[PDB]
């Protein structure tokens, strides 16, 4: 009690939330502030009365130390992966199966952000999938969201879904 | 006035220590209110040791209550005896270490814990002459495991001239269905091996199987456990509430049944073993009693006291009975050309003689052995930890939290190391 | 083909579980036996959800409907109903009682019946809280509707406010509900107008009618400030700031400051933070004013409850006061970190200064002070006893970076934390405590995310994280020489350890620190030569002890730093350290024996520092030749290790073994007047003294003068070695006087083992080094330990005379091994296979895998290929040399499957048998049987075979014929074969008559059994000489006869369980008595009394042996 106490009063008043968006692409990246609104920046967002908590990383080399600290924890994590990048797939996959681990409970939610699509070869929802080891995950609440530079065009249920999902869980006043 | 101070942490020890403190203030005369209404003066004399006398000689308990969710502190608060505690002595959170150490060690735990340490501080403080402490908690949960191991460093960096007790709570799997109960438990004996005095190991392996075999019953429940227990800690505890020749307070008996630093651990025992409800059936003898407590039927721990050899014993007769009488059957017990010649009783044993008998019987008999077959259970939980720990099975549970896989190495090796001891003083003895 | 989601599943797993009970309560009730049992279990499925209730929120529907459809039944019993309130309990317990209480019925049909119910309910009932405490939530739920009870209209607002009433001062948990049931139902507009002030009148008298000294009146007090704090909550503006200073003036008498209850001062600050708040609008106020200097006050509590709540009161109460009384607010808070103040105001004024942050009531005005006043807070320790305080103010301070960090922009917070970034790194490394290593790490972390551009942040960042910090001695040696790599992070590290944590209480700060600044030394030569080691020189005459116990450390491992850097260029020492330097280390053993301070506990430290830098110093060639501070140190290095028993036995190992240390260094650095020779002098004074205290009747000083003879070099042993051997020798063996000392055999063979190590080989020179002259000699010595078997009241002590053996042993063949193989002889290598295959062997788990360890280097070795291993083709087998790293011998599950295939070759099966007979019996019941589950499956396959079952039975009668009068093997043995003549492993040799291996075995039973007054040993041979029944011929008549003999036993025992023992052996086998003489014979063992006088003994034993025909 005390400090912890303090701790969930604030994070169920406030509604505040924390986000580990991580990727291979930076212009990805960028098209989803543009909707919410090695590096590391922190920058706090407000979108639908949600003080979310953009914590964008540059390299994943380091990611274990930017997955949780003393005071609060990660809770989602949306990974940004390239469909016509076949090469650097087995790092993301190694990532993904390291990091995100089996609970007793339930873990964060991840979103796999697909940008660039319309490119030739590119991989279809299931393919990117299987190409992850997504099936293997269990804990964990899972959504492929594909985007497009040419329609652009199918991002808002995803979103909605990752918000719903994130604030459903420990969020409850309402 | 030599003071202990009693502490309750978790739910199996905050469930023991509420019927504990119910049990003794049956034999101290004291009421739910507080006054005293007895017919002896043999009470009074060494109330202090567990009370505290306020205005309007009401006798107060000084024990400290703690858990990491609010259900137990809500139990005692309303039973029999909850208003004979101190309001303020109740301290607990409102989640629990979901049966993980770091959970109620290295994270929940650590918080509460300067809060429990105000607390020992103020009790402590009223005392005119402090000696040790107690603790009473499981080793099979997570806030029972962890959060009371904190307490004894704590209480051995900040007072290691005083004296540290404990009755621990080993599992089984006959009872708890729990997977990562090795864990917990090695993860405990690695922490009071190396600071503590004396500990009294009760299996919830034995209790069971007392209660199931020799009681007969079909579904046995918590209630039947916790019925022995109670009794043993009650007949263990008889030389430090009660005056006595043998005057022999916490310190003299660690001085006396420990000694060596590392083997400190016990066997208590009770005898004769009933259910709840019917216990006063007939009044036993002496020689009855002689032969009923060595037998391993009635021992807490499952193991086997013969195989092995006897370090310290004891013995607290209790009911009407003069010393004279308990020295003429312990010497035909020790003596070969008789007829009530025993192998499987012990030779040296320091006996002692009360008045008052216990609450149920008009006679009964404790036993405080030492000996070297408690190891069965040490190996037993060491193959039940390497079971899981080859595949490192549930293994990244505790990792994540901070722990590391060096300080479960140490705990084998230390365990290994205690095992080894155990084995090596089996042949002890002057020649 | 867009979006797709992954497989979900139901977070409850036991749905149809909880259901199943929730629908067979109505034949549950009745029984302690079906009632104990399935609470019991409702209570372990409850558990499982306590950290994350909000999961079965979509389950608070059912369970609830399931329960209330039972309780509002007429038919159905009390306890049934006492049992759903029972279970109801449990739900709301993990979920809450501000959530799931909005679920139940709460019409107009449901205020009389509950009303009623809660009515009959008798508060003298402890076997029922539950339903009152439930009853009590319930009926305050009803009262928020806006319906008059007019219409329902002694009155119904007179029924409810006296039981609600009632429970304001009972001592159960019902007194919290009581509370919301007054706040919820006299807040209501139809009762705040005919019932608000008679409470209040109530309130006011109890709360002065009361004292702290009885118990009731406190709970009644508790209760009274509840109720009140409740309402004050529940209650608008406009109805409570009327009665908001009567209040407060009869709250001030209560003298709540001043008594000895935390729980009524926790309410009172909570009470009057509520009240200063009424006032100001959502000061002027006279109450909000000494509201203020109230919660202050409380911020000095001695207790980590209150201060939180008056922290709360003092941040809330700021953010309505306007900023022309703020600043006095923040000012005070300024004043609590005076140095005239206890850590409390510290704590109480770090939370206050993060409640402002956090809730932006500060300007950046005070930043100026905030940044000094958590610099201090970072370093605040103080003395207080065996302890010291310091952990909450720091963790409060990094709470206190973290929230400001968070709160205002990266350009608000530039300054600071460019002035905080020195302050975070150090704390978060070089702290005692691992929870705020972890806080300041995560601090420093959030600051540099926030601010993006940081000088040097990644770096730290990935170099410590959250869990590379958790290990604080990676921390002091691994994270500190990382950070110290850049220029902005070296100078504050190393004057924060020489000021703060060399001068520690505790010993393992100090020699963490010292071993780090070992490492810190190397990135700076000239600041830490010519800034700090003056300090630490001047530190070493002061009346702390412990401070100069870190400061001796300090220079001791600087000048090793200062050794290495300059070897690394090929420079003396000189060069950086001036003479001021040299002459002031010189002068430290003079000082300290000049003042007398190797006396009392603390001398200990003193010494181990002094011979740390002894070692320290030798180990980097100092100008110290000829002077007398040589000959100071030698005699300080004999004193040692002539006073160790003094020296408690918990530090004990680690002075002698530093001393030795030292020891060897100072001679191989001084003791040289030319290379190739040394001081004759200097060496015949240390060999005579050596010689004579080897023989000193103290153990101790024998031990430390053994293991100061084993450290000494090579040319110094020059000229005078086979004196030292011989003296090594003579106190290895043991005398009628010297018989508990396993510890001088130890240390003896060590010494012996390093001098053979350091000496090396050397062919015609048997004073130089050891040579084919004297090897013989040694090998002699070394193996006359192996029988050792020190038996006193420490247990089997021999094992560390044992152990020792061993390892001399092996580093003897693998030094001779590489140097003139022709010294190992094929006998000598034959005989230590042999005994180190015994130790393989042996009842305890530890000291059979340092032996089987020891087996398996000796046998796989080929560099080169070591001679004389007997069985070498056969033994590479059994051992593969892939399955080193895979087999647990501590194990005994997995020791004996594999050790008891050595049997089967006719050299490794005398040693293997003793060792596997002591093992297959004894006392550890794990043991035993996996000995005899893994005896019987090697017999498999030598039992149809009678020459080799022959050659087992002869070495096995050979081997108990060798151990007779010997009670260490001959108990063990006999329990053994019994253990085999019970498996019926030779019932080949019981077609014969006078079987040989019966004959002599018997023989040699009762030869062993005459005048046995170990009545384990009268049991063993009675319970032997039933098995030998199977053998037919003379062999059955003379058990007969030895078994009738002790059925007239001095002990009563035993003419007992002879008896007892011959109704089972006679049972068991066939063919023994004659079936109408059977009958007679069990009726007389079934109607004989052999605990009775020995007068109808004799005779009953006379009618037996007339019965079976056996002569007396
Ligand atoms: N003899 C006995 N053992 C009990 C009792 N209650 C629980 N246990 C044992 O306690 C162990 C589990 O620990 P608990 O006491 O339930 O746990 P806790 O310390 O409260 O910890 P968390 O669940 O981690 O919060 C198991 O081995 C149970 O068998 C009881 O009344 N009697
Ligand atoms: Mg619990």
Redesign the interface.
Known sequence: ?????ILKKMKQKERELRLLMLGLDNAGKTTILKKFNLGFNIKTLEHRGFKLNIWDVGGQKSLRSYWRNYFESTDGLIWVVDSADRQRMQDCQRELQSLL????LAGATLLIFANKQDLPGALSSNAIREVLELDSIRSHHWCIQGCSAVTGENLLPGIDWLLDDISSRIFTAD | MREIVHIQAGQCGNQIGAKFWEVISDEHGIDPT?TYHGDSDLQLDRISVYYNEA??G?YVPRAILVDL???TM?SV????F??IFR??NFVF????A?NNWAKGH?T?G???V??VL?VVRKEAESCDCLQGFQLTHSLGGGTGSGMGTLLISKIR?????RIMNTFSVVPSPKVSDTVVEPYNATLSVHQLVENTDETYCIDNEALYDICFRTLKL??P???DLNHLVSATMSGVTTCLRFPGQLNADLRKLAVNMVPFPRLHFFMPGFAPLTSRGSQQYRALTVPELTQQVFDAKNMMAAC?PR???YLTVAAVFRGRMSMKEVDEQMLNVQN????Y?V?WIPNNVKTAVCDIPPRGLKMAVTFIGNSTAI??LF?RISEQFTAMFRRKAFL??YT?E?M?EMEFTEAESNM??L??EY????????? | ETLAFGAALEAFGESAETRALLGRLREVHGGG?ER??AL?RFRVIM??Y??QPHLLDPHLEWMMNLLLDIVQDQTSPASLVHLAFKFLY?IT?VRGYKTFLRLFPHEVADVEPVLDLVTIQNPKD?EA?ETR?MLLLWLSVTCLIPFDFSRLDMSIMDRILQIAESYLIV????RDAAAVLVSRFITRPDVKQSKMAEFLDWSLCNLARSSF???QG??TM?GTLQALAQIFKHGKREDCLPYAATVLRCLDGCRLPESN???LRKLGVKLVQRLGLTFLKPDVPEGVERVIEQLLVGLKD????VRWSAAKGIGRMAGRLPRALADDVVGSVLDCFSFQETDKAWHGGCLALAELGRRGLLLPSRLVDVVAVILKALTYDEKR???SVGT?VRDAACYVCWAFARAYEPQELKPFVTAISSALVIAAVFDRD??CR?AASAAFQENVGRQGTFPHGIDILTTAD??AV??RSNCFLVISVFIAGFPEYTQPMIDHLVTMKISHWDGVIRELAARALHNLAQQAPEFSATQVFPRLLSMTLSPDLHMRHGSILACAEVAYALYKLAAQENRPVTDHLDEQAVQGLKQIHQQLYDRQLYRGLGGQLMRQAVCVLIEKLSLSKMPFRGDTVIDGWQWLINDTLRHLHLISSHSRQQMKDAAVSALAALCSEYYMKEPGEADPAIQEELITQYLAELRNPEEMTRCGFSLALGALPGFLLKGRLQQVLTGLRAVTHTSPEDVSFAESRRDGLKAIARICQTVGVKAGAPDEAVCGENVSQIYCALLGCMDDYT??????VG?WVRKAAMTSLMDLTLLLARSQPELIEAHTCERIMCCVAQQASE?????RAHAASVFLTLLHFDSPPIPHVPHRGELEKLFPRSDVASVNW?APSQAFPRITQLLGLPTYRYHVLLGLVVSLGG????TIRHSTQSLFEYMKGIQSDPQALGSFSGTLLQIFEDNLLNERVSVPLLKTLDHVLTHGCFDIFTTEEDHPFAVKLLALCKKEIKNS?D?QKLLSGIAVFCEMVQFPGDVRRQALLQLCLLLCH????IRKTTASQVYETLLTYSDVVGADVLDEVVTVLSDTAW??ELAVVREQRNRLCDLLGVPR
């Open positions: 009690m005390g400090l912890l106490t681990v089996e609970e007793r | 507080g205005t309007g009401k969710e609010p259900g809500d608060r309303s039973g029999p909850g208003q309001p303020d959170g409102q989640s629990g979901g290295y929940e650590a918080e509460l300067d809060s105000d960096e900040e007072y290691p001239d079909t579904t429940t918590y209630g086997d195989h092995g050899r070969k050309n008789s007829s010649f192998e190891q069965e190996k990244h549970w994540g901070g590391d290994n190391d095992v080894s084995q090596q003083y089996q042949d002890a003895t002057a020649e | 036996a104990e049992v019991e558990d499982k306590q950290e449990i317990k402890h809280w405490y001592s159960d948990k019902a000294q009885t118990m406190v709970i508790d209850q935390t729980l001695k207790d980590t409850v006893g065996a302890c909450n691992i929870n972890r959250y869990f958790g290990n038996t006193d009241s420490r247990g089997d094992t009842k305890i788990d530890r000291f501590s006392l550890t019941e794990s007054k009545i001095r002990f009563p025992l605990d009775a």
